[PDB]
């Protein structure tokens, strides 16, 4: 009879960045998926592998709730198969995904008149990411200039660059607080119910 909190990972006060996304494993629930539907605020609600009218009538093994803040344009790289900076260097979804990518719009929350330099994303990496892989190595990157001594000269960059979040950016440069629910449908004792 305990309803597991979507009041802790959805209407949270500050979301983590893209290079370090949170994850809260949700277990032992009576899971009310009906507060997710009844809002026009949730901009994109794409469910892959599971029809959204049958979320209330399904039982799973684990629910992973990932959370980050990306630009408006990038809310279409969080999908199976796409490329671009967010989906190869920051947070890659697998091909056989069974989840529900949810993302509303928050420009009243994550923006300042001079800029919001809290949220950050990655720029370069030697290999593109494996599924659900997270790395928070903020080292002064080896891009060439093979004697590297740290002082960030020519041919060596920082691997993070911040977002510029102002209210006067349009739609393509506004924060969209994505939450990626990921159902683990493995033949097991059924944990989370309806």
């Amino acid at each position, epitope marked *: 009879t305990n309803l597991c909190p979507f009041g802790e990972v959805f*209407n949270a*006060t500050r979301f983590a960045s893209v290079y370090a996304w949170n994850r809260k494993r949700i277990s032992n629930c009576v899971a009310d998926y009906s507060v997710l539907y009844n809002s026009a605020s949730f901009s994109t609600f794409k469910c892959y592998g599971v029809s959204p009218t049958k979320l209330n009538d399904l039982c799973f093994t684990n629910v992973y709730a990932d959370s980050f803040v990306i630009r408006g344009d990038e809310v279409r790289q969080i999908a199976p198969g796409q490329t671009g900076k967010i989906a190869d260097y920051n947070y890659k979804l697998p091909d056989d995904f069974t989840g529900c990518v949810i993302a509303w719009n928050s420009n009243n929350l994550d923006s*300042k008149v001079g800029g919001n330099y*809290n949220y950050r994303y990655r720029l370069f990496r030697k290999s593109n990411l494996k599924p659900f892989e997270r790395d928070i190595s903020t*080292e*002064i990157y080896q891009a060439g200039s093979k004697p590297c001594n*740290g*002082v960030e000269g020519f041919n060596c*960059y*920082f691997p993070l660059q911040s977002y510029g979040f102002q209210p006067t950016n349009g739609v393509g440069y506004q924060p969209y607080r994505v939450v990626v629910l990921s159902f683990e449908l493995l033949h097991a004792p059924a944990t989370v119910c309806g």
Partner: antibody
Amino acid sequence: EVQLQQSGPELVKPGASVKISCKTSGYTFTEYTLHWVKQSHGKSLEWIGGFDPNFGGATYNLKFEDKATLTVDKSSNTAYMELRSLTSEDSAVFYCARGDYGTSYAYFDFWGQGTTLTVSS
Amino acid sequence: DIVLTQSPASLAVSLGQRAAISCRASQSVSTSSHNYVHWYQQRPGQPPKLLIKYASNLECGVPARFSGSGSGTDFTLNIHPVEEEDSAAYYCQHSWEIPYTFGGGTKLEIK
């Protein structure tokens, strides 16, 4: 100018709750966070967590989710903090900082006087 | 969590020369356009007050002599004239992740 004032000093019996006021005056309330900082007799400053008055939530440090809470009054421009479940080592001076617009704070501009809190019998 | 330790914690300086207080960070708390460490000042019996924002850009209302700089993990502070007003503790900070941790802080006593 922008200034902040807190309550007075107070002695605390172990296992009790104290409401620390912070009355702000001088700027638009819903455009600036109010963080709280604890400092224990010459030790290092530690960040408790701050409220976001336009959103209506708070972001506590993970070593203070158990004993701290932040409630504000948007009408009379006051921000409160209540400390519960306190041991005797959580006796310090408690500061009331001011941040930036919501989820964009990086520095603390203006500070208050600070209510020294003592735990004894 | 990110920890910061300031050395030298015991700094005594004469009135003519400069000072040099350090802030060594755990991770490389730095990006290509910002350095995410700030500085403070705390007199005894007084609330703290800001010196620098984002480790180089100077806060409005200072005597314009506190100006530090640093790249990556090691950050330093520079006070070239020292007076009786600069007899206080000077804490560091970082704003990288969501626990913001102030440093230990060194006491600058005039000689």
